[PDB]
Amino acid sequence: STIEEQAKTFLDKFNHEAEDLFYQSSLASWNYNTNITEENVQNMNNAGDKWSAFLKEQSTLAQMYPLQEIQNLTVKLQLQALQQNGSSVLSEDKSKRLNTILNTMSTIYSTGKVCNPDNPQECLLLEPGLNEIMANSLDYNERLWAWESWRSEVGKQLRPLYEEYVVLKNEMARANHYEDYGDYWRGDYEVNGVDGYDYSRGQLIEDVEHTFEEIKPLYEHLHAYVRAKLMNAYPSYISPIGCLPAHLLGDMWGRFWTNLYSLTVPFGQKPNIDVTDAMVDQAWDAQRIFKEAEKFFVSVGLPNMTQGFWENSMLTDPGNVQKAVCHPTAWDLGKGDFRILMCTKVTMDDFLTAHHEMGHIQYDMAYAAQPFLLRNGANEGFHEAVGEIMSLSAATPKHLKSIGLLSPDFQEDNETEINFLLKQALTIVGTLPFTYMLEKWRWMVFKGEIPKDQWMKKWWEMKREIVGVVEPVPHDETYCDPASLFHVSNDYSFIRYYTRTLYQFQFQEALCQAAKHEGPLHKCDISNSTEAGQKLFNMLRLGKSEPWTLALENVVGAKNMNVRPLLNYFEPLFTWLKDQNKNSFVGWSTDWSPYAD
Amino acid sequence: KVGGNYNYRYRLFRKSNLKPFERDISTEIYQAGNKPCNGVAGVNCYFPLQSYGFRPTYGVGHQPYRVVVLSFELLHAPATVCGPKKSTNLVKNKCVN
Numbered sequence: 001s002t003i004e005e006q007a008k009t010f011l012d013k014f015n016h017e018a019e020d021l022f023y024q025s026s027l028a029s030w031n032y033n034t035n036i037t038e039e040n041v042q043n044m045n046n047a048g049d050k051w052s053a054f055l056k057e058q059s060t061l062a063q064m065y066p067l068q069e070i071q072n073l074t075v076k077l078q079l080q081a082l083q084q085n086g087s088s089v090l091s092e093d094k095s096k097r098l099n100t101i102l103n104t105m106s107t108i109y110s111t112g113k114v115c116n117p118d119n120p121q122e123c124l125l126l127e128p129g130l131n132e133i134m135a136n137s138l139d140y141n142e143r144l145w146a147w148e149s150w151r152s153e154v155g156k157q158l159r160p161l162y163e164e165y166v167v168l169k170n171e172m173a174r175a176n177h178y179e180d181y182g183d184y185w186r187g188d189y190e191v192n193g194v195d196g197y198d199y200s201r202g203q204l205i206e207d208v209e210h211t212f213e214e215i216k217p218l219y220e221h222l223h224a225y226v227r228a229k230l231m232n233a234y235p236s237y238i239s240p241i242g243c244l245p246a247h248l249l250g251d252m253w254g255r256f257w258t259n260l261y262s263l264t265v266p267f268g269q270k271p272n273i274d275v276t277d278a279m280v281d282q283a284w285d286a287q288r289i290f291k292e293a294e295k296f297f298v299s300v301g302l303p304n305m306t307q308g309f310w311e312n313s314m315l316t317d318p319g320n321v322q323k324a325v326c327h328p329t330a331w332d333l334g335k336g337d338f339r340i341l342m343c344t345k346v347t348m349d350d351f352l353t354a355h356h357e358m359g360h361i362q363y364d365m366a367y368a369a370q371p372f373l374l375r376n377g378a379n380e381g382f383h384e385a386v387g388e389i390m391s392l393s394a395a396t397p398k399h400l401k402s403i404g405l406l407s408p409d410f411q412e413d414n415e416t417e418i419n420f421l422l423k424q425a426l427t428i429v430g431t432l433p434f435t436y437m438l439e440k441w442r443w444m445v446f447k448g449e450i451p452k453d454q455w456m457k458k459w460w461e462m463k464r465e466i467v468g469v470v471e472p473v474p475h476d477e478t479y480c481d482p483a484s485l486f487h488v489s490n491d492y493s494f495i496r497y498y499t500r501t502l503y504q505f506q507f508q509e510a511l512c513q514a515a516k517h518e519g520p521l522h523k524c525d526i527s528n529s530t531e532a533g534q535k536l537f538n539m540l541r542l543g544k545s546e547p548w549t550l551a552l553e554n555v556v557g558a559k560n561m562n563v564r565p566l567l568n569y570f571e572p573l574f575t576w577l578k579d580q581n582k583n584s585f586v587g588w589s590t591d592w593s594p595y596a597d
Numbered sequence: 598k599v600g601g602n603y604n605y606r607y608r609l610f611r612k613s614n615l616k617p618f619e620r621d622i623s624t625e626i627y628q629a630g631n632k633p634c635n636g637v638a639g640v641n642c643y644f645p646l647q648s649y650g651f652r653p654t655y656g657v658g659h660q661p662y663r664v665v666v667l668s669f670e671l672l673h674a675p676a677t678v679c680g681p682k683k684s685t686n687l688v689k690n691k692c693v694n
């Protein structure tokens with residue numbers, strides 16, 4: 001009897017059947033990824049289909065234990081993450097239509113071909129193509145073409161499919177007792193009934209719009225600096241009070257300003273620290289890199305690698321014709337089996353990617369004792385916020401000279417710290433308005449505030465107001481510019497990249513205060529310190545066991561995300577920019593336009 | 598076994614804990630609900646013996662281990678098993694102990 005006691009013996013058999021089938025699926029997928037052939041695509045979707053039906057039936061069986069009569073927290077959190085219907089609450093033909101739309105939307109993006117108006121025999125794909133034209137080219141009209149042609153070729157097929165995808169997604173989300181599909185997405189940062197750690201779905205919007213009001217004083221000065229620097233690369237094409245043309249920001253959509261570093265480098269001839277000739281003159285390899293990445297975690301107070309990690313991972317490209325899709329990843333196949341798949345070359349970028357990727361294996365090893373349904377980060381933007389602080393610490397010019405890659409007599413000056421901080425700001429603080437504005441447009445368009453005849457109007461109005469860029473070519477209601485992004489045409493949430501950027505610096509300031517650091521925050525190092533490893537391990541080991549607002553409390557001492565550490569990391573750059581824009585005009589006007597002149 | 602060695606099983610559900618040095622081999626279907634199921638698996642009626650899926654690419658602590666527990670007792674019989682008595686050389690024509 002005691003319905004709470006039958007759920008315990010149901011989750012007692014699930015936790016084993018699932019743990020046995022998931023390992024099969026994961027190993028079958030690894031065997032394909034590391035080695036592509038004709039049957040390793042068959043016996044991998046075989047295991048995927050055998051693991052999906054199991055879960056789809058175990059949910060039907062778990063629909064029998066009402067979440068009311070349950071009283072424990074772990075069993076409730078496990079049943080609540082297994083009772084979710086998702087799809088298969090729609091009709092059968094409506095689900096078929098939704099799946100067809102979702103599969104037709106991604107192949108218009110994957111196989112998009114933009115043709116040259118002068119030589120339309122051969123055309124260009126996106127990646128080996130427009131993605132490098134928008135990166136390196138310094139011609140105005142060439143970039144204008146590469147932008148408009150892609151937004152008008154793959155921008156007008158996704159519109160009549162996105163119009164229906166919105167409706168079907170809303171109809172699905174309202175059948176799961178949400179109010180729209182935006183609320184379904186925000187229902188990941190939701191905590192209910194913990195008496196002092198609650199977090200409603202309606203508070204994420206408020207918190208995001210409340211933290212974005214303190215980044216504007218820094219984004220405005222960065223915008224003014226980059227505008228005054230771009231006025232010299234394309235003279236007479238930019239107004240000194242207006243916004244920036246939306247096709248000069250360094251890539252296809254303007255998500256990262258990192259390619260603007262060659263034009264807007266603060267101090268002239270002062271190359272920033274790059275240990276890549278020291279590596280090849282000291283004869284490193286793909287083994288020494290990982291052996292040096294592991295000694296860091298062992299010094300900080302964390303375990304070794306499991307010795308099954310060393311003889312099962314694939315960290316080198318297979319020299320022969322053994323084609324493998326290698327994009328650095330950390331696998332967690334289960335049953336204590338951790339592996340890493342990446343094509344390691346002897347560069348400092350791989351030296352930092354190794355630390356990043358092993359920061360995931362450490363997180364995975366931490367919570368490996370939880371039940372099967374509670375092995376994940378506290379929420380969406382935790383598993384990467386944890387990986388990024390390791391690579392933040394491993395690249396300082398003080399950890400490099402104590403590792404044998406930077407001459408001892410090397411002396412750093414502020415004229416290179418400014419360069420490092422500006423190169424960091426173009427990537428970190430350059431994407432926050434873009435992320436916030438995109439996920440605000442999506443929420444508003446899902447809730448029904450933006451009617452279907454005012455999509456591009458509000459899109460470009462917000463692009464001019466919030467992020468401060470203006471379109472070069474007018475766009476009527478036949479376009480869909482947001483759907484020209486990988487995460488929009490492929491149905492992905494896009495707010496984890498906003499919360500991760502704040503969790504990262506919260507964690508860094510919380511940890512590197514326990515290391516008793518003295519100078520600025522962008523010089524912190526957590527090596528040779530166990531008070532930081534033991535403070536991070538007290539959060540790494542929980543998983544989804546406790547609410548994310550309690551996992552945050554353990555490390556940083558606060559119960560929400562804060563933007564003060566992110567502003568305290570860029571204080572030198574802010575002080576430099578502030579008394580460098582005295583002759584410029586901080587801010588922009590939303591009336592200028594590069595076509596109405 | 599590469600592919601899984603399911604020959605090894607173990608019991609997962611029992612009504613009441615065992616006794617010291619007791620052994621159960623029952624294969625009756627455990628009942629976690631309030632309705633009988635008449636020896637048929639299904640809802641709230643589980644098969645009590647799950648299997649170990651030993652594969653070689655596991656992690657230490659999930660790999661198989663062979664265990665041998667020994668137990669000594671002296672009930673009432675005034676002789677039985679005991680270890681070896683060592684004997685050294687032997688000299689002659691000397692007063693010895």
Ligand SMILES: *[C@@H]1O[C@H](CO)[C@@H](O[C@@H]2O[C@H](CO)[C@@H](O)[C@H](O)[C@H]2NC(C)=O)[C@H](O)[C@H]1NC(C)=O
Nearest residue numbers: 031032034035036037038039040318321322323
């Ligand atoms: C990559 O996959 C191919 C295709 O499955 C493998 O080719 C054969 O794999 C079987 C698997 O046991 C071997 O017994 C054969 O000797 C392989 N033949 C050849 C010509 O390769 C290939 O071995 C896989 N790569 C690796 C490193 O195992």
Ligand SMILES: *[C@@H]1O[C@H](CO)[C@@H](O[C@@H]2O[C@H](CO)[C@@H](O)[C@H](O)[C@H]2NC(C)=O)[C@H](O)[C@H]1NC(C)=O
Nearest residue numbers: 004007008009011012071072073074075076371
């Ligand atoms: C239900 O919640 C209780 C706590 O309220 C859990 O009790 C803990 O169980 C673990 C083993 O899983 C023990 O190591 C702890 O010592 C127990 N807590 C205390 C305070 O002793 C219980 O495990 C939960 N139910 C299930 C099925 O896990």
Ligand SMILES: *[C@@H]1O[C@H](CO)[C@@H](O[C@@H]2O[C@H](CO)[C@@H](O)[C@H](O)[C@H]2NC(C)=O)[C@H](O)[C@H]1NC(C)=O
Nearest residue numbers: 060063080082083084085086088089175176177
């Ligand atoms: C997941 O879907 C199932 C059915 O597909 C839901 O169970 C039914 O819910 C309806 C409406 O609440 C009831 O009228 C039925 O009696 C339920 N049982 C059936 C159809 O067997 C279930 O509630 C859904 N889960 C959640 C969390 O909403």
Ligand SMILES: *[C@@H]1O[C@H](CO)[C@@H](O[C@@H]2O[C@H](CO)[C@@H](O)[C@H](O)[C@H]2NC(C)=O)[C@H](O)[C@H]1NC(C)=O
Nearest residue numbers: 266267413414415416417418419572575576577
């Ligand atoms: C880096 O630090 C040096 C001193 O450590 C700075 O040089 C001085 O800067 C002030 C600022 O106006 C000047 O008044 C002084 O005249 C400078 N010193 C000399 C000897 O001329 C330098 O400005 C700093 N650079 C940055 C980018 O902050």
Ligand SMILES: *[C@@H]1O[C@H](CO)[C@@H](O[C@@H]2O[C@H](CO)[C@@H](O)[C@H](O)[C@H]2NC(C)=O)[C@H](O)[C@H]1NC(C)=O
Nearest residue numbers: 299398399400401402403404525526527528529
């Ligand atoms: C972390 O601690 C290790 C061990 O104390 C440091 O390595 C020592 O560094 C000093 C100074 O370069 C040498 O004289 C010792 O011989 C080193 N010992 C060993 C065992 O390597 C390391 O420099 C420390 N790193 C940081 C960043 O503080």
Ligand SMILES: *[C@@H]1O[C@H](CO)[C@@H](O)[C@H](O)[C@H]1NC(C)=O
Nearest residue numbers: 294295298301302303304305
């Ligand atoms: C980690 O591995 C190294 C191998 O060089 C060994 O010396 C060290 O004792 C190990 N640490 C632990 C905690 O096992």
